Design a protein around this ligand. Structure first.
Ligand SMILES: O=C(O)C[C@@](O)(C[N+](=O)[O-])C(=O)O
Ligand code: SF4
Length: 753
């Protein structure tokens, strides 16, 4: 066909639209119905399109992703498990991005230099394992994973998996980009088919066009409010309609990115002329030309069916700000000042933070600079503290060159290193004490309790970068940039004009400094060294195989009440230090979950000693004494970030099963991967039949089968027993993971020994 390379760093790996077309055509001859865009890309990547059972919401698809991307907080454990597989080289184009371990303290260069010294052991390990297994390495300072992927690796029609739940960002360039745990990335790096439950498809038809203060962020702040955080579970969100040509390519990436907050499998936009324009300005005009020739396969079929349709008229949409402790609590900016007042949310904004991969594009920085130049023209500067995170080195070098960084510095902003920083709590925040109630507004995406600064009483609101800038200048939520007046230096009242700015640089992007490290694909004789006394890295010891018996008289470690995110199960911030060390990071296990017994965090009753104490310590006491335990959870258990540490930590400390009303997708997959039993109540009311003191027996593991429920005997202290039924979503492939003790153990059994 054409021999067009997948990226500038892999000149030999060609885009296979011929394969994609061939597979779409085998499948549509079988289904004889129009296919949505996500169906064309996903089914076009099936391992076996002639025989695969295809039913939305029901069958597991065996897929062949084109590439794997990892960020350094999840890459360490993905690579420790790849190292246990014993396999010599990764099977597909794979990259590591070092963006999660650079703490914000002093700003830019200073924080990067400190991070490189503090994290040397870990950056060393990743660069060395990268050179040895043939994984490309983007050095600390290079940029945030999703911005480097949009700029270099995402293209129309790619199926990409990343060990990070905001991998959907890549949907802004017409690709299917899906968040997974590190063990799923090991399947694909090992060359074995990746499995994904066939998604439902929610269509969102966009009408009209954006005007004035409304930006692409408002489309997904509005959708999250409509769908709620559990509304997109098990579905891909597919944006379509005449209003799509009104959104820049980075804007589409913004909207696809935050679809992670409604639990969606991923989001996607159809190939159009805004993507073509972005591909040509990022050195990939040959890929835009090839996608023009396969354009029919990169847009939805006429008359395709969506399982749910939502319509949004971009011309009526007005600025939104969401939170404070969930991303789906939506408010127009115009009314948040009055709702805050009512609910007792601090009206004064201590810190305004722009950037992160969600909103650090050249157009986002240009629009924020446009608001900032107006304030400057009246002698004002920010009343709140103000920080700016560039998404990549190329964006930092280009906004520096075109003068936007200096405008943002002149209004009082501090430019932070090109890294997650305050977005996952890597922020040395000193202006408030812990427990001090305060408000910060961000252009980020998640705004859950204690995530930006480990203070549970910080009220974080997510909005667009131009609104964070307007509100940072005002210093209060009780300011609506569309209506209200500011007072300059000179005494005159003035109103902020709506920001206008170029979406892409008129000149080319300035690539900034050299940050990519290609693997020697020659040499590769590296020795990965993990010191046996390291506190940051530890090689894995395999988990135990199943004993062949039912699980009797299980102790409940904790029955959790309400929301239980993976930041409640395995907190980030300070614990990022131990992401490559399973025993040390297991000391945060479930310390944020609320115990229904006393409604406290990290305070559970030890059944033997009858002392209330920390959840980690109690689980290690049960493990030490041979007591197998269970977690009982509520709805959407495991919501959030993809970190497989939330599944590895309960396995390591002696847990056996997690029984909930429902699971978020990535966490449920991660639990199955590590040999635990994620089970749901066949009747959710049965959550109330189980009390912390009850013991449980799960029966029927001997004839464990797809679609057959498991029986659970609740043993009450007084001698009463109640039998209830538990559903599970295991197919046969996955029951083999459970019988072997984990998916990695099963893979190593298939290597003939
Ligand atoms: O797992 C991590 O490293 C944290 C993270 O960036 C990742 N994520 O999976 O969403 C987040 O947003 O919580
Ligand atoms: S922590 Fe924030 S900036 Fe980093 S990859 Fe996740 S969403 Fe993006």
């Amino acid at each position: 066909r054409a021999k067009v390379a997948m990226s500038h760093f892999e000149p030999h790996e060609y885009i296979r639209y011929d394969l994609l077309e061939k597979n779409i055509d085998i499948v549509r001859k079988r289904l004889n119905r129009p296919l949505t865009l996500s169906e064309k890309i996903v089914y076009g990547h099936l391992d076996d399109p002639a025989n695969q059972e295809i039913e939305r919401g029901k069958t597991y698809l065996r897929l062949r992703p084109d590439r794997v991307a990892m960020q350094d907080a999840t890459a360490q454990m993905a690579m420790l498990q790849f190292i246990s597989s014993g396999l010599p080289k990764v099977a597909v184009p794979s990259t590591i991005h070092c963006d999660h371990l650079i703490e914000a303290q002093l700003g830019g260069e200073k924080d990067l230099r400190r991070a490189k010294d503090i994290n040397q052991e870990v950056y060393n390990f990743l660069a060395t394992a990268g050179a040895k297994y043939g994984v490309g390495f983007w050095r600390p300072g290079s940029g945030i994973i999703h911005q480097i992927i949009l700029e270099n690796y995402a293209y129309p029609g790619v199926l990409l998996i990343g060990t990070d739940s905001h991998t959907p960002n890549g949907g802004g360039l017409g690709g299917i980009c899906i968040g997974v745990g590190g063990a799923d990335a090991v399947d694909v790096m090992a060359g074995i088919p990746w499995e994904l439950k066939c998604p439902k498809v929610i269509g969102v038809k966009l009408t009209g066009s954006l005007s004035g203060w409304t930006s692409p962020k408002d489309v997904i702040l509005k959708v999250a409010g409509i769908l709620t955080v559990k509304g997109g579970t098990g579905a891909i969100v597919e944006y379509h309609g005449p209003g799509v040509d009104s959104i820049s390519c980075t804007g589409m990436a913004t909207i696809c990115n935050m679809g992670a907050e409604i639990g969606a499998t991923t989001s996607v936009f159809p190939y159009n002329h805004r993507m073509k324009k972005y591909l040509s300005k990022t050195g990939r005009a040959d890929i835009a030309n090839l996608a023009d020739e396969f354009k029919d396969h990169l847009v939805p079929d006429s008359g395709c069916h969506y399982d749910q349709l939502i319509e949004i008229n971009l011309s009526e949409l007005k600025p939104h700000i969401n939170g404070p402790f969930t991303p789906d609590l939506a408010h127009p900016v115009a009314e948040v000042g009055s709702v805050a007042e009512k609910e007792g949310w601090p009206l004064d904004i201590r810190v305004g933070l722009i950037g992160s991969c969600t909103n650090s594009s050249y157009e986002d920085m240009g629009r924020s600079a446009a608001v900032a130049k107006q304030a400057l023209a009246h002698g004002l500067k920010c009343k709140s503290q103000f920080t700016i995170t560039p998404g990549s080195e190329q964006i930092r070098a280009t906004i520096e060159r075109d003068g936007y960084a200096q405008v943002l510095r002149d209004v009082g902003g501090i430019v932070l290193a090109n890294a997650c920083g305050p977005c996952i709590g890597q922020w040395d925040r000193k202006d408030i004490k812990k427990g001090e109630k305060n408000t910060i507004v961000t252009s980020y995406n998640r705004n859950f309790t204690g995530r930006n600064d480990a203070n549970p009483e910080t009220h974080a609101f997510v909005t667009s970068p131009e609104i964070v800038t307007a509100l940072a200048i005002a210093g209060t939520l009780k300011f609506n940039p569309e209506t209200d007046f500011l007072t300059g230096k000179d005494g005159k009242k003035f109103k902020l004009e709506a920001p206008d700015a170029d979406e892409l640089p008129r000149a080319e992007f300035d690539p900034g400094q050299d940050t990519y490290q290609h693997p020697p694909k020659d040499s590769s004789g590296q020795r990965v060294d993990v010191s046996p006394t390291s506190q940051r890295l530890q090689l894995l010891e395999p988990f135990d195989k199943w004993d062949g018996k039912d699980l009797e008289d299980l102790q409940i470690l904790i029955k959790v009440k309400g929301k239980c995110t993976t930041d409640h199960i395995s907190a980030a911030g300070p614990w990022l230090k131990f992401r490559g060390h399973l025993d040390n990071i297991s000391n945060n296990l479930l310390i944020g979950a609320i115990n229904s017994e006393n409604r406290k965090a990290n305070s559970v009753r030890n059944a033997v000693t009858q002392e209330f104490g920390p959840v980690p310590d109690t689980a290690r006491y049960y493990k030490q004494h041979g007591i197998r335990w269970v977690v009982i959870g509520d709805e959407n258990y495991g919501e959030g970030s993809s970190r497989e540490h939330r599944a590895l930590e309960p396995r390591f400390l002696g847990g056996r099963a997690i029984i909930t009303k429902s699971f978020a997708r990535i966490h449920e997959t991660n639990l199955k991967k590590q040999g635990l039993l994620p089970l749901t109540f066949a009747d959710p009311a049965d959550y109330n039949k189980i009390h912390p003191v009850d013991k449980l027996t799960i029966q029927g593991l001997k004839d464990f089968a797809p679609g057959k429920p498991l029986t659970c005997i609740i043993k009450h202290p007084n001698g009463t027993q109640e039998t209830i039924l538990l559903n599970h979503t295991f197919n046969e492939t996955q029951i083999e993971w459970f019988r072997a003790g984990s998916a990695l153990n099963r893979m190593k059994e298939l290597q003939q020994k």
